[PDB]
Write a protein that binds this ligand. Structure first.
Ligand SMILES: C[S@@+](CC[C@H](N)C(=O)[O-])C[C@H]1O[C@@H](n2cnc3c(N)ncnc32)[C@H](O)[C@@H]1O
Ligand SMILES: [Zn+2]
Ligand SMILES: [Zn+2]
Ligand SMILES: [Zn+2]
Lengths: 242, 167
């Protein structure tokens, strides 16, 4: 043919370039960290069930269709659950469905940190309490993460993992999202909150304060139960992460 | 029976491009500050001033025409990531009578040379200049690799706006 109706094939780089990058056998290693990007958590052998579900929050849908509902006055927000879209009385004006609606802040820029390797910044200002991005990875058990840590993962110096309370770990060594590049600060500007979305536990990043564009996203590693093995710059710096 | 060899000096930029599009959710500044048309004209001008005076220029212009045609026929269907499809639809809507060689720039031109070998060896749009393009592409790629620094950069990429993810 010449003269042929092409069929949409999504672009993906060829096998050789991928194999050369993964094995550091090209003209120069690109400043690109090897991790697989996922859209949602991958339950390896455990599902992080929250233990409970949502309800109908009695929140009164505002007369003005643009005012947000369930804004810090909601029952589900008091139990860290996201409103079900077909039971929330606020309907389509519900603010308490940010995670399941995939309402990220799409102003995130990766960069090379000064003494931390990788880091993330925001190219737009962010009001306080705003939802940033979900921390994605492989939901593994305690034993499976110990397996991966002792016999598979070598770069323990920068652990790409977050912990869940029930002994489960969100391992972002192999698979995850950009949130694996968010480093630590003793005086953080963000916070990791655990929410019950459709009865499953999810972890989201939220703004602890107002911040202008260009600031680096940081959260406290001590306030989240994992560092079983620092140069942040704060005045009351804890010396080492712990 | 045709496979295009991408220079070793260009594969790291393809890795960077994949990382910027699929994993950092960035977009190339469309329309390009220097489009495929101007890049092809720069290559033509760089090929004119050499040893063989005037006895190679016809084939050079014909190869430029073939490259532009294959880019314009393969861009929207084979040279696009899944994340760039809303941008492609917006470009098609705003500029209907504008071939892709006027909109896109160096990275998509490079992406052409990783899948053109399928169409050259099985569905060639022109069998009268097929053998000439096969002769010249492994030198056009060398030109691109020599100018990689000025052609390919992360400065032409921007973080996608939040309304783009809603598409
Ligand atoms: C999940 S990684 C975050 C991204 C990481 N900085 C990178 O380059 O990929 C956490 C690691 O970052 C490093 N890190 C975090 N805060 C740091 C700081 N204030 N100074 C130096 N390194 C830091 C620590 O080594 C920690 O193990
Ligand atoms: Zn509510
Ligand atoms: Zn609600
Ligand atoms: Zn510190």
């Amino acid at each position: 043919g010449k003269y042929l109706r092409q069929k949409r094939i999504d672009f993906q780089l060829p096998y050789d370039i991928l194999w050369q990058w993964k094995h550091n056998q090209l003209y120069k290693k690109p400043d690109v960290p090897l991790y697989k990007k996922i859209r949602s958590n991958v339950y390896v052998d455990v599902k992080p069930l929250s233990g409970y579900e949502a309800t109908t929050c009695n929140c009164k849908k505002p007369d003005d269709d643009t005012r947000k509902g369930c804004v810090d006055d909601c029952l589900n927000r008091m139990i860290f659950a996201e409103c079900s879209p077909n039971t929330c009385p606020c309907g389509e004006q519900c603010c308490n469905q940010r995670i399941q609606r995939h309402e990220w802040v799409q102003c995130l820029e990766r960069f090379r940190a000064e003494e931390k390797g990788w880091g993330i910044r925001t190219k737009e200002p962010l009001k306080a309490g705003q939802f940033i991005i979900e921390y994605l990875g492989e939901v593994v058990s305690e034993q499976e993460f110990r397996n991966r840590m002792i016999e598979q993962y070598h770069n323990h110096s920068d652990h790409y993992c977050l912990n869940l309370d029930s002994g489960m770990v969100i391992d972002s060594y192999r698979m995850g999202n950009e949130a694996r590049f968010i480093n630590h600060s003793c005086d953080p500007n963000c916070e990791m909150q655990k929410w019950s979305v459709n009865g499953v536990y999810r972890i989201g990043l939220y703004a602890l304060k107002d911040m202008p564009a260009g600031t680096e996203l940081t959260y406290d590693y001590n306030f989240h139960s994992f560092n079983v093995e620092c140069k942040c710059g704060f005045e009351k710096c804890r010396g080492i992460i712990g | 029976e045709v496979k295009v060899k991408i220079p070793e000096e260009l594969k790291p930029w393809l890795v960077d491009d994949w990382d910027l599009i699929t994993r950092q959710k960035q977009l190339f500044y469309l329309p390009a500050k220097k489009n495929v048309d101007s890049i092809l004209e720069d290559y033509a001008n760089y090929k004119k001033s050499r040893g063989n005076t005037d006895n190679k220029e016809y084939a050079v212009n014909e190869v430029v025409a073939g490259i532009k045609e294959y880019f314009n026929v393969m861009l929207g269907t084979q040279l696009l990531y899944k994340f760039e499809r809303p941008q492609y639809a917006e470009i098609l809507a705003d500029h209907p009578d504008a071939p892709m060689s006027q909109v896109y720039g160096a990275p998509h031109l490079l992406r052409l040379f990783v899948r053109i070998g399928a169409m050259l060896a099985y569905t060639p749009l022109d069998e009268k200049s097929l053998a000439l393009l096969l002769n010249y592409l492994h030198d056009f790629l060398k030109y691109l690799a020599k100018n990689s620094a000025t052609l390919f950069s992360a400065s032409d990429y921007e973080v996608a706006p939040p309304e783009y993810h809603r598409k």
